Each structure stands twice: as C-alpha cells, then as structure tokens.
Design an enzyme around this catalytic site. Structure first.
Site, PDB file in Angstrom:
ATOM      1  N   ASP A   1      61.282  20.868  15.729  1.00 13.09           N
ATOM      2  CA  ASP A   1      61.722  21.773  14.672  1.00 13.09           C
ATOM      3  C   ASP A   1      60.616  21.978  13.653  1.00 13.09           C
ATOM      4  O   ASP A   1      59.827  21.075  13.419  1.00 13.09           O
ATOM      5  CB  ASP A   1      62.958  21.170  13.985  1.00 13.09           C
ATOM      6  CG  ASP A   1      63.652  22.145  13.048  1.00 13.09           C
ATOM      7  OD1 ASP A   1      64.513  22.894  13.540  1.00 13.09           O
ATOM      8  OD2 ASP A   1      63.351  22.182  11.831  1.00 13.09           O
ATOM      9  N   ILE A   2      60.552  23.166  13.060  1.00  8.92           N
ATOM     10  CA  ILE A   2      59.530  23.463  12.063  1.00  8.92           C
ATOM     11  C   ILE A   2      59.894  22.886  10.694  1.00  8.92           C
ATOM     12  O   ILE A   2      61.050  22.898  10.281  1.00  8.92           O
ATOM     13  CB  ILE A   2      59.285  24.977  11.930  1.00  8.92           C
ATOM     14  CG1 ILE A   2      59.060  25.605  13.315  1.00  8.92           C
ATOM     15  CG2 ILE A   2      58.134  25.244  10.958  1.00  8.92           C
ATOM     16  CD1 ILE A   2      57.776  26.410  13.476  1.00  8.92           C
TER      17      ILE A   2
ATOM     18  N   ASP B   1      63.896  28.124  14.401  1.00 14.00           N
ATOM     19  CA  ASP B   1      62.673  27.321  14.396  1.00 14.00           C
ATOM     20  C   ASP B   1      62.812  26.045  15.255  1.00 14.00           C
ATOM     21  O   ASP B   1      61.842  25.302  15.428  1.00 14.00           O
ATOM     22  CB  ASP B   1      62.257  26.965  12.963  1.00 14.00           C
ATOM     23  CG  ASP B   1      63.118  25.851  12.333  1.00 14.00           C
ATOM     24  OD1 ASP B   1      64.281  25.630  12.751  1.00 14.00           O
ATOM     25  OD2 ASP B   1      62.622  25.194  11.391  1.00 14.00           O
TER      26      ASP B   1
HETATM   27  N1  LIG Z   1      68.065  33.199  15.579  1.00 20.93           N
HETATM   28  C1  LIG Z   1      68.508  32.046  15.065  1.00 20.93           C
HETATM   29  N2  LIG Z   1      69.331  31.270  15.812  1.00 20.93           N
HETATM   30  C2  LIG Z   1      69.769  30.117  15.292  1.00 20.93           C
HETATM   31  N3  LIG Z   1      69.473  29.557  14.122  1.00 20.93           N
HETATM   32  C3  LIG Z   1      68.640  30.341  13.420  1.00 20.93           C
HETATM   33  C4  LIG Z   1      68.109  31.548  13.812  1.00 20.93           C
HETATM   34  N4  LIG Z   1      67.285  32.068  12.824  1.00 20.93           N
HETATM   35  C5  LIG Z   1      67.319  31.161  11.883  1.00 20.93           C
HETATM   36  N5  LIG Z   1      68.116  30.089  12.178  1.00 20.93           N
HETATM   37  C6  LIG Z   1      68.464  28.966  11.318  1.00 20.93           C
HETATM   38  C7  LIG Z   1      69.071  29.073   9.921  1.00 20.93           C
HETATM   39  C8  LIG Z   1      68.037  28.330   9.075  1.00 20.93           C
HETATM   40  C9  LIG Z   1      67.413  27.335  10.059  1.00 20.93           C
HETATM   41  C10 LIG Z   1      65.970  26.959   9.806  1.00 20.93           C
HETATM   42  O1  LIG Z   1      65.872  26.132   8.651  1.00 20.93           O
HETATM   43  P1  LIG Z   1      66.102  24.556   8.749  1.00 20.93           P
HETATM   44  O2  LIG Z   1      67.498  24.291   8.328  1.00 20.93           O
HETATM   45  O3  LIG Z   1      65.625  24.073  10.070  1.00 20.93           O
HETATM   46  O4  LIG Z   1      65.185  24.038   7.694  1.00 20.93           O
HETATM   47  P2  LIG Z   1      63.774  24.215   7.224  1.00 20.93           P
HETATM   48  O5  LIG Z   1      62.916  24.581   8.387  1.00 20.93           O
HETATM   49  O6  LIG Z   1      63.779  25.072   6.004  1.00 20.93           O
HETATM   50  O7  LIG Z   1      63.467  22.794   6.830  1.00 20.93           O
HETATM   51  P3  LIG Z   1      63.462  21.498   7.613  1.00 20.93           P
HETATM   52  O8  LIG Z   1      63.439  21.816   9.065  1.00 20.93           O
HETATM   53  O9  LIG Z   1      62.148  20.906   7.238  1.00 20.93           O
HETATM   54  O10 LIG Z   1      64.532  20.616   7.080  1.00 20.93           O
HETATM   55  O11 LIG Z   1      67.501  27.947  11.365  1.00 20.93           O
HETATM   56 MG   LIG Z   2      65.704  24.384  12.098  1.00 19.74          MG
HETATM   57 MN   LIG Z   3      63.170  23.465  10.252  1.00 15.42          MN
END
Ligand SMILES: Nc1ncnc2c1ncn2[C@@H]1CC[C@H](COP(=O)(O)OP(=O)(O)OP(=O)(O)O)O1
Ligand SMILES: [Mg+2]
Ligand SMILES: [Mn+2]
Ligand SMILES: Nc1nc2c(ncn2[C@@H]2O[C@H](COP(=O)(O)OP(=O)(O)OP(O)(O)=S)[C@@H](O)[C@H]2O)c(=O)[nH]1
Ligand SMILES: C=C[C@@]1(C)CC(=O)[C@]2(O)[C@@]3(C)[C@@H](O)CCC(C)(C)[C@@H]3[C@H](O)[C@H](OC(C)=O)[C@@]2(C)O1
Ligand SMILES: [Cl-]
Ligand SMILES: [Mg+2]
Lengths: 330, 189, 189
Positions: free
Chosen positions: C20-21, C64
């Site tokens: 994950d990013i 991500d």
């Molecule tokens: N096409 C998609 N399918 C599924 N989920 C999606 C899609 N586009 C975006 N997302 C989602 C909603 C927000 C999330 C990405 O943010 P995430 O919650 O992973 O945190 P972040 O990357 O800001 O921080 P971190 O991973 O460091 O906690 O992925």
């Molecule tokens: Mg994510």
């Molecule tokens: Mn993330």
C-alpha cells in the site's frame, strides 16, 4: 445415507434436551454436571425468594423464622465461587417447605423461573450428599444456556445423522443462517406449556406468541422454501398439569381458544382428559394454520406431541421421524 | 485508454458489522457459510442496477463487504448526484430485507462525494474498469468516518443536494487523514 | 436451490502479500488527476509483470493497495518464497518510478501464510478475490509494516525454510491487531 437435522426454536424450548436424549438413545462425565445441578438449585430458590416482595400483591412468609433464611439466601445471591456448605441446603430446604414460598412458586409465570425448579428442590437431600451421583433424569433436567452452534453425530441402523443444536434467544438467532444450506430437515421445538409466560429477552412478549412469530419466520423464510419442518410440540407434561390445575386459563392469553373444538380425527392418549386433548390440539392448530397458508407442496410440516425429558416418548417420536425422512427421500 | 470527467458522483457503502459476524469454525465450514450470506447481500444490491430508475448507476466493484458505485460516467445537470443518494436508500431496503430472513441487524454506512475523476483500465493483467482521483479518495473518507444509518456528504456535494430539494445537517469539522479539517453534512431522510 | 450458486473454493498452504502507498490521499491532493494516474499505472503495470515472473497471481487493486497470492490456482510448495521474491522486486520497482517520475512514492509490504477462500461474489462485475482470517492478518501486516520493507509473520517464516535473514519485526507495537492476536512479526533484510 447421512441426514443433517437442525434444531430451531425460542430459548428454553427444549432443544438441548432433545440432543441429550439422542446420546441416551443412540450413542465419567456425570462428575462435571454436578456443579451445574447445584447452580440450578441455587438459582431456583433465590429467584422464588427474591420475587416474594416484588409481586403485586406481595407474598408473605408462613413462618417468620424463615425471614432469617431469606436474608441468608439474598446475601449469597451474587457470590462468584459458592462453596455450598451444608448450611445452604438446610436453609434452602426449610424455605421450600414454607407455605409462603410455595404460593410464590405457584405464581412463577409472573417472573423468570427455570423449568427444573421443582424437580431439584424436591431432592435437596439427594444432591447435598458428597457421594452424590446424577441420574439420567437429573442430567436431562439440568438447564444450561446454549450459545453458539454444536454438532452431534449418531448412527441408527447403519444410517448417519448430524444434529445441530443452536441458541434460541434473540441475540443467538443470527447464527442459524450458517446451517440453512443443505439441511435435510428442520426440527422446530416449542414449549407448549409457556402460554401464560413472557420471554426473558424483554419481559413483555408472550412466550407462545414468540414461538408462533418465529415459526412463521422459519416456514416463510427465503432460504428454506423447500425444507420440511418436523414440529415438536414439547412440554406436554407441564401443559396437562397446567390445564388441569385450572389457575391459568388459555383463553386469557389466546382469546381465540374460546371458539375452538377438538378435531374429529383427534387421537387422544388412553385415559387422557378431554380438556388436555382440546388444549394440546388447539396449540398444534395455531402452528398448522401458518404452515397451511403457504408452501404449495414444495415442503411440509410434521407435528408431534412431545416431552423431551421422557426417554420413552423421545425414542417413539424420533422413530416416527426416521420414517418421515426415509419415505419422503429427504 | 483513460478518459477525464468533470462531474462524476462516487459512493462507498459499507457494512461495518460484517467483519464481526465473520468467524471460522468446523460448523460454518471455515467461514464459507458466512461468505454465502455476503454473496446473497451483494446479489440483492446488484439486482437494483436492472431497475430503470438506476440505469445511470455503474457498479465499479466491491471492496470486501463495501459496495462501490458511481453515476455520471455516461456523459438538472446535477440530477445524477441526487440519483446516487436514491440508490443508497434502496440498498438499505435490500439490507433490511436480508436482515429479516437472516435474523441479523446489519446496518449500512454511506459516504458520497462528487468531482473530476479518471476512468479506464490500469496495469497489465485484466481489463478491469475503475475510477481514480482525489474525488474518489474523499468519497471513501466520507464512508470510513461516517455513522451507521447515515449518508455523509461533503460541503459542495451538500450544496448541490440542497438545490435538488434535499435537507442536510452539519456534522461539524473533522480531521480527515491527508486532507485536514473538512466541514461535512448528513443527508436528512 | 434457494441460495444463489456460489463460485468459491477453499485453498490451504498459500501465501498472501499486500502492498500500500504511504500518504496516497495527501499525494492525490497535490498533483493533477492525470499525473496520479500515469504514476500509478507506471507502477502497477510493472508489478503485474513482476507478478507473472514470480508465479504470483495478482488479485485486485484498491486505489493505492496492491495484492497477490501464491499457491493459486494450482498448488506450489515454493509459495512463501514467491511472495518474498515478489516483495523484493516490487520495492526495487517503486524506487525506479520514484526517480524518473519525481513523485514521492513509498509502499509498505506485508506477508502471511495459511488458508484462503477464493473466487467471486454477487452477479454483476465479477472480480477474483480472497477471504479468510489469514487474509485479514496479511492486510494488517502491511498496515503494521515499514516504508519500503517486507513485513512477514512467523507462520510465513516457517515456510521460508531459512533462506532469508530477518530481524525482530515489533509489529505488535506498530499495529493493534497484531498485538491483540499475539502475532510475532519479522523484517526481511
Ligand atoms: N478505485 C479505488 N478502489 C478502491 N479504493 C480506492 C480507490 N481509489 C481510492 N481508494 C481508496 C480510498 C482512499 C484509500 C487510499 O488512502 P489510504 O486510506 O490507503 O491512506 P493513505 O494512503 O492516505 O495513507 P496510509 O496508506 O499511509 O495510511 O483508497
Ligand atoms: Mg490504501
Ligand atoms: Mn495508502
Ligand atoms: N418438564 C419438562 N421440562 C422440560 C421439557 N423439555 C425440556 N425441559 C426442561 O426445560 C429446560 C430448558 O430446556 P433446554 O433444552 O435447555 O432449552 P433450549 O431450547 O436448549 O434452550 P436454549 O439453549 O435456546 S436457551 C431444561 O431444564 C429442560 O430439562 C419437557 O418436555 N418437560
Ligand atoms: C468479508 C469478510 C472479511 C472478514 C474477509 C476478508 O478477509 C476481507 O474481505 C479482506 C481483508 C480481504 O478480502 C482482502 C481485501 C480487503 C479489502 C483488505 C478485505 C477487507 O478488509 C474486508 O473487511 C472489510 C472492512 O470489508 C475483510 C476483512 O472482510
Ligand atoms: Cl418456545
Ligand atoms: Mg439449549
């Protein structure tokens, strides 16, 4: 040939008892159940004693001496690990002999009391013994709440059976779903004598009415459209005892009973009082009246008058169940 | 090929209580029986897409037990946003029906946002349509920071809903991971 | 039959990898929707290629979040090694895309091994996926990982047959799920 039977019904209907009878019939541990039997005993006396001052009108003690024993019981009511000193059994027995305590017991339908209350209190002198060994009937009467799903397997004439026991209370029903798929048949248990009582869950909903709503929910369910239901109209002994006593009238809880007559095709037991016949069949028809409304041949309902604590009655009705499964190619 | 869009409405509908319902035992066949129910739930939601009033709703995918969908991908310039809210109501009806037969009480938690997105396929494996953007990220945050039985929308999304005849109640300002303080609203049912 | 036909099959002895990013919502708030997508496609296309080279089956991409499994479809005793090698190549690829793009991309990697259920759910828009407590754990291993490193469990380490040098993971102190479940984590060097 294997058959998967599922046990459904409201809490305290007699599902776990049915499973026990299966072991006594088709299948060292008695030493652990003693503790449970003593808990039932304790729970029984404390509940009757606690209800005395809360009923309207309240029930008075016949012997002011027993007021001290009442004080005794109430003080140990919440003691986690109770050691059951010989004193306890003495006080408990003395209270059970008090007429006041008995009158309160008679109105037990007005509060929540376990079914084995009378059975255990009448044999305190037997349970108190340190060399006490639980009889078959003792293990059948012992009440312990079911939470989760349990599987029991047994053979009958080289035919396999997988019986599933589940919790009947509201919060537990959410687990049933995990047994709907590929179920050979369903056994719906009903506490027929619970017409003058209300469920524990809210203290308002009539126990028999809850049974009826629950059956309608199972009979009409979207995932059980082609699943037949074997209806056990359990607690036949307590039903007859109640009907004959005459204190609680069925028509006071279920008005429709006043316009009910026994069906022609009724098969009463030898020497069975007409009033008992009329009552047990009325209850059966309230359930059949639901099973008749829908289905349209894709599944049926097979009624049985039952008393789970009687290994005699169970051997008989289960054999009748064995025939239904096989002749219908389930 | 990827295509840009200016006004697409995204929605994330979760079932927070499912994770807890899910368990692995010998009776439920290592959680298979639990998944059997999830399959019934998704199926009932998927069947709403065939209703003429929802012809403009595109189901993007399902993340775990969360349902992801969008409107405005086939482009009262704003009615599609209002339609997304109508679809979120219908899922609740479907989940309420499931609850009735499964003796459960699952509740949906919705989050909806709107804005520009990129639509298309990504990677090198399978042709799977998807949508990306900050708009999709915020939509999801509206779900994860949402409340059971509520539909949480953003400020501009709330304004558009009002022009369409929708009542909205301020939830307040919340610190959304990566965005900071955002003022959000709850749609009034 | 009253239950919809379920297209799901159980599989033991498999490995699951999540990636994950870090701060993707913060990143998508800075660059145009195009850049985010180009950068994201540049990264995942390579991963997808690296997946096939390592005998890993890419499942799906959640914005991500990227994930795949080994030991599927057909069994392979080399499973744990595949995901470990997959992580290795992945972390390297992330660095190249970080250089030629200029975008600050960093990913946490997590791995666990055990049984899974896989297939599809619902009727519309089918997408191969996996479900099980073990899969849930793998997901948390990523959350409890460290930027640009491979975070593995003891279960996974026992399938590695001692071919990689690890060090104390301390995941319990980085993620609440790992602690409450008494999980012993490690970090591949
Ligand atoms: N096409 C998609 N399918 C599924 N989920 C999606 C899609 N586009 C975006 N997302 C989602 C909603 C927000 C999330 C990405 O943010 P995430 O919650 O992973 O945190 P972040 O990357 O800001 O921080 P971190 O991973 O460091 O906690 O992925
Ligand atoms: Mg994510
Ligand atoms: Mn993330
Ligand atoms: N007199 C009498 N008592 C019965 C009969 N069937 C069951 N009981 C008693 O009723 C009590 C409750 O039965 P039980 O089997 O525990 O209910 P249950 O349906 O399993 O309950 P639950 O697990 O959903 S909460 C037990 O003490 C049992 O011995 C019966 O036909 N007659
Ligand atoms: C369906 C139930 C259960 C428990 C099964 C499962 O393993 C998951 O589907 C994973 C882990 C798993 O499928 C991998 C993808 C993703 C998206 C990470 C899932 C979600 O976190 C699910 O929870 C949610 C919140 O939808 C979760 C945990 O739900
Ligand atoms: Cl009942
Ligand atoms: Mg029970």
């Amino acid at each position: 040939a294997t058959h998967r039977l599922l046990l459904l019904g409201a809490g305290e209907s007699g599902k776990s008892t049915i499973v026990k009878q299966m072991r006594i019939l088709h299948v060292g541990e008695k030493a652990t159940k003693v503790q449970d039997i003593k808990n039932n005993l304790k729970e029984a006396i404390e509940t009757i004693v606690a209800a005395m001052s809360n009923l309207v009108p309240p029930v008075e003690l016949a012997n002011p001496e027993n007021q001290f024993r009442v004080d005794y019981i109430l003080s140990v009511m919440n003691v986690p690990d109770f050691d059951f000193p010989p004193e306890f059994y003495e006080h408990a027995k003395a209270l059970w002999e008090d007429e006041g305590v008995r009158a309160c017991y008679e109105r037990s339908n007005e509060y929540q009391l376990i079914d084995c209350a009378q059975y255990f209190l009448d044999k305190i002198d037997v349970i108190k013994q340190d060399d006490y060994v639980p009889s078959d009937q003792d293990l059948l009467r012992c009440r312990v709440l079911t939470s989760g799903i349990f599987e029991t397997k047994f053979q009958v004439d080289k035919v396999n059976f997988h019986m599933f026991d589940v919790g009947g209370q509201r919060d537990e029903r959410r687990k049933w779903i995990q047994c709907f798929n590929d179920v050979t048949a369903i056994i719906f248990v009903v506490a027929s004598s619970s017409y003058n009582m209300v469920i524990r869950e809210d203290n308002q909903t009539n126990r028999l009415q809850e049974a009826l709503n629950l059956f309608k929910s199972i009979w009409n369910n979207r995932w059980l459209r082609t699943i037949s239901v074997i209806l056990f109209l359990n607690k036949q002994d307590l039903l007859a005892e109640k009907v004959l006593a005459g204190k609680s009238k069925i028509e006071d809880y279920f008005p429709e009973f006043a316009r009910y007559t026994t069906p022609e095709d009724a098969t009463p037991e030898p020497g069975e009082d007409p009033r008992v016949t009329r009552a047990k069949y009325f209850i059966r028809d309230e359930f059949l009246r639901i099973s008749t409304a829908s289905g349209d041949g894709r599944h049926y309902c097979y009624p049985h008058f039952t008393c789970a604590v009687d290994t005699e009655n169970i051997r008989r009705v289960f054999n009748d169940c064995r025939d239904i499964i096989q002749r219908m190619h389930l | 090929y990827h295509q840009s869009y200016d006004c697409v409405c995204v929605m994330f509908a979760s079932i927070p209580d499912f994770k807890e319902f899910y368990t692995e035992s010998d009776v439920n066949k290592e959680g298979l029986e639990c998944l059997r129910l999830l399959n019934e739930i998704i199926a009932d939601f998927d069947d709403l897409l065939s209703k003429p009033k929802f012809s403009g709703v595109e189901k993007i995918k399902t993340i775990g037990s969360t349902y992801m969908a969008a409107t405005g991908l086939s482009a009262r310039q704003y009615m599609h946003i209002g339609t997304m809210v109508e679809f979120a109501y219908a899922l609740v009806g479907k989940l309420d029906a499931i609850n009735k037969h499964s003796f459960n009480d699952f509740k949906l938690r919705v989050g909806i946002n709107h804005g520009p997105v990129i639509a298309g396929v990504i990677g090198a494996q399978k042709p799977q349509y998807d949508i990306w953007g900050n708009t999709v990220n915020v939509a999801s945050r509206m779900d994860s920071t949402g409340v059971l039985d509520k539909i949480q929308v953003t400020e501009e999304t709330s304004l558009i809903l009002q022009t369409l005849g929708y009542t909205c109640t301020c939830r307040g300002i919340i610190n959304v991971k990566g965005k900071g303080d955002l003022k959000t609203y709850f749609v009034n049912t | 039959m009253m239950f919809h036909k379920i297209y799901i099959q159980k599989h033991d002895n498999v490995s699951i990898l999540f990636a994950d990013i870090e701060g993707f919502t913060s990143l998508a708030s800075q660059c145009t929707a195009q850049e985010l997508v180009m950068t994201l496609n540049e990264l995942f296309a390579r991963f997808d290629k690296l997946a096939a080279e390592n005998h890993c089956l890419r499942i799906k991409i959640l914005g991500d979040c990227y994930y795949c499994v080994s030991g599927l479809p057909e069994a392979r005793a080399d499973h744990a090694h595949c995901c470990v090698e997959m992580g290795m190549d992945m972390i390297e690829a992330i660095s190249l895309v970080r250089e030629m793009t200029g975008v600050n991309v960093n990913m946490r990697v997590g791995i666990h091994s055990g049984r899974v259920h896989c297939g599809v759910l619902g009727l519309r828009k089918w997408q191969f996926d996996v479900w099980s407590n073990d899969v849930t754990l793998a997901n948390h291993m990523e959350a409890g990982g460290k930027a640009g490193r491979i975070h593995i469990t003891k279960a996974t380490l026992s399938y590695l047959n001692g071919d990689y040098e690890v060090e104390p993971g301390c995941g319990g102190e980085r993620n609440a799920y790992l602690k409450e479940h008494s999980i012993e984590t490690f970090l591949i060097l």
